[PDB]
């Protein structure tokens, strides 16, 4: 069930030569879109740079994200208050079985969720005094609630369907990991067994350990992106030094037809 989600961020005091407002756009786990207040232009990212796309798509992403730039910076004026502020927004949609769109519209102030847009009602609201202040400022600004409604109920679902038709490739891309399994001495009597998966897509991957073909646990896992939208992971298990060769590492991944056993 693939999703188009904008991650928007405004700060009341940007560090020198960084933007007061910037947006990353995501089709599932890939970034397709970048926008910031300094350049003022929505742009395709990586593979989406040569998506079979219409001539005005990027101009219309730019138009919408500039209105959000102005809106997010108005919100600070409604707080007055004290300290510096971070307003974040998670706005988008996901397709539902019977050609229906399920929307998301949440906001966070200094790192904590406080506000949402109700798509049934066309109103901002939350449990918090700051949600009342920002909703009231926004709701009163001419056509703010309507463009928010439109962005989520019209633009996000059309954009999502166009990306499925025009960029199907980008989303079906399957790069299985390159694997390593190394053992390092840690404490006297003990070694750390690290199973590493390199340069894989999509991100869903399961690393677990066997000892003489019996489940020896998942180990302790880390996860991260690469520069090219591929991913990296490792899982470490502490083991009896002199026992390393009895252990192997198993990896499940959408790219691999059957699970892959990696030996030391």
């Amino acid at each position: 069930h693939l999703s188009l989600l904008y991650h928007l961020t405004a700060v009341s005091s940007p560090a020198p030569g960084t933007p007061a407002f910037w947006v990353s756009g995501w089709l599932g786990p890939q970034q397709y879109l970048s926008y910031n207040s300094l350049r003022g232009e929505a742009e395709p990212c990586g593979a989406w740079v040569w998506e079979n796309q219409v001539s005005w798509y990027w101009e219309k992403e730019t138009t919408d994200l500039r209105i959000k730039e102005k809106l997010f910076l108005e919100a600070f004026k409604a707080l007055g208050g004290k300290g510096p502020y971070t307003l974040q927004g998670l706005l988008g949609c996901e397709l539902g079985p019977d050609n229906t769109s399920v929307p998301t519209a949440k906001f966070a102030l200094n790192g904590e969720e406080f506000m949402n847009f109700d798509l049934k009602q066309g109103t901002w609201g939350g449990d918090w005094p700051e949600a009342l202040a920002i909703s009231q400022r926004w709701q009163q600004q001419d056509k703010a609630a309507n463009k928010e409604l439109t962005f989520l109920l019209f633009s996000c679902p059309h954009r999502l369907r166009e990306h499925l038709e025009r960029g199907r490739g980008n989303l079906e891309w399957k790069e299985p990991p390159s694997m390593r399994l190394k053992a390092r001495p840690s404490s006297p009597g003990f070694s750390v067994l690290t199973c590493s998966a390199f340069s894989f897509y999509p991100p869903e991957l399961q690393l677990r350990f066997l000892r003489n073909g019996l489940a020896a646990g998942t180990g302790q896992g880390d996860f991260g992106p690469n520069s090219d939208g591929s991913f990296h992971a490792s899982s470490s298990l502490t083991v009896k030094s002199g026992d390393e060769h009895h252990y192997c590492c198993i990896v499940q991944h959408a790219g691999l037809a059957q699970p892959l056993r990696v030996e030391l």
Binding site: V11, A108, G111, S234
Partner: protein, 99 residues
């Protein structure tokens, strides 16, 4: 709230000496968004370093990738140095090849 950055250092492809590769420093789970990241070669900073867009996770905490094209060797040691308001002193994490 305020949140201290988690720091991972890994190569894009398995670490082969002599072979051209990419060194990644993934900084994640931090708030606020103002953060400084240096990639070090032999405890000295690399000038030709790029980064992904400052983004954030479902829990609203930010993340950021710093990466450089490099060619590793037996002798050369790499690290990531990070400074954030939540840190009293810079935090340095060495690239261990295992991971």
């Amino acid at each position: 709230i305020q949140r201290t950055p988690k720091i991972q250092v890994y190569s894009r492809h398995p670490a082969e000496n002599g072979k051209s590769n990419f060194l990644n420093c993934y900084v994640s789970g931090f708030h606020p968004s103002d953060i400084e990241v240096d990639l070090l070669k032999n405890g000295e900073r690399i000038e030709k370093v790029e980064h992904s867009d400052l983004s954030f996770s479902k829990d609203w905490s930010f993340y950021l990738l710093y990466y450089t094209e490099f060619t590793p060797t037996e002798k050369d040691e790499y690290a990531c140095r990070v400074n954030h308001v939540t840190l009293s002193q810079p935090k340095i994490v060495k690239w261990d090849r295992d991971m």
